[PDB]
Design a protein around this ligand. Structure first.
Ligand SMILES: Nc1ncnc2c1ncn2[C@@H]1O[C@@H]2COP(=O)(O)O[C@H]2[C@H]1O
Ligand SMILES: Nc1ncnc2c1ncn2[C@@H]1O[C@@H]2COP(=O)(O)O[C@H]2[C@H]1O
Length: 246
């Protein structure tokens, strides 16, 4: 029917949110696929063909044959392979028999990456290129991206001040910054693909130094709650690099 569809959409965060042009342009395209309990829907490593939204049924998610996740009706999956052109990041096994609505790679790139996952698209180069972020899987980079805001600082602007409360952690997209400490002047300098602002957040301390743009500098910024959950791999390197130690 066309009522099951208009309900699919009204209840999906990605879709209820598109303009009726994208919205029309997506109910037209959804193909439905039934699947028996015990069928693999997508295999880890495979090329990404489709995006799925679960009408009825339940799935289990396996990363290297561990099992990591679980979803029911309303939930969607298969979006990372298509937005990024990477292999499948997880195997998705059917846990009870299911009816899935499928968007082909082409329409996904047409409507949904354009608009639902805009952020993931924009930060993808930063996140793939930052050294401290190398251990992150595409699923991780995606969750991290959703949480980032962008700020541009100009020459001579203060980004953070020694002694302040910290709230954000910072990833330099391009630019140049000086780190300074009263009594000591400039003690370090950062640039594209450096990060700063973890010491306050890792240790619950005030900011331990002032950071000042010396060129036009674009950062992505991540709040404390996100720093606590979205950097899982990278977090051990941040504690290991932490200048509050020798
Ligand atoms: N822990 C996880 N790691 C990787 N992918 C996951 C995880 N949990 C759920 N997924 C979803 O499972 C899908 C497997 O295929 P994709 O990489 O295209 O998109 C993936 C996500 O949409
Ligand atoms: N030698 C250093 N001492 C203090 N902070 C530094 C140093 N080098 C780089 N920084 C960065 O400057 C940041 C200032 O705020 P935070 O203390 O939150 O986190 C600090 C580090 O990320």
């Amino acid at each position: 029917q066309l009522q099951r569809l208009e309900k699919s959409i009204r209840n999906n965060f990605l879709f209820n949110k598109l303009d009726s042009d994208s919205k029309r342009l997506v109910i037209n395209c959804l193909e439905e696929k039934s699947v028996p309990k015990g069928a693999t829907i997508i295999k880890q490593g495979d090329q990404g063909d489709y995006f799925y939204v679960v009408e009825k049924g339940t799935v289990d998610f396996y990363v290297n044959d561990n099992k990591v996740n679980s979803s029911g009706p309303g939930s969607s999956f298969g979006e990372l392979a298509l937005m990024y052109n990477s292999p499948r990041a997880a195997t998705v096994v059917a846990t009870s028999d299911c009816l899935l609505w499928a968007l082909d790679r082409l329409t996904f790139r047409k409507i949904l990456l354009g608009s639902s996952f805009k952020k993931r698209l924009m930060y993808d180069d930063l996140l793939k290129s930052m050294p401290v972020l190398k251990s992150l899987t595409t699923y991780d980079r995606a969750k991290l991206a959703d949480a980032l805001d962008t700020k541009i600082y100009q020459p001579g602007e203060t980004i953070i001040r020694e002694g302040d409360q910290g709230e954000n952690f910072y990833l330099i997209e391009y630019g140049a910054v000086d780190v300074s400490k009263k009594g000591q002047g400039v003690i370090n300098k950062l640039k594209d693909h450096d990060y700063f602002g973890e010491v306050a957040l890792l240790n619950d301390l005030p900011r331990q130094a002032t950071v000042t743009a010396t060129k036009r500098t674009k950062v992505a910024t991540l709040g404390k709650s996100g720093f606590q959950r979205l950097l899982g791999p990278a977090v051990d390197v941040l504690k290991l690099n932490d200048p509050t130690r020798h």
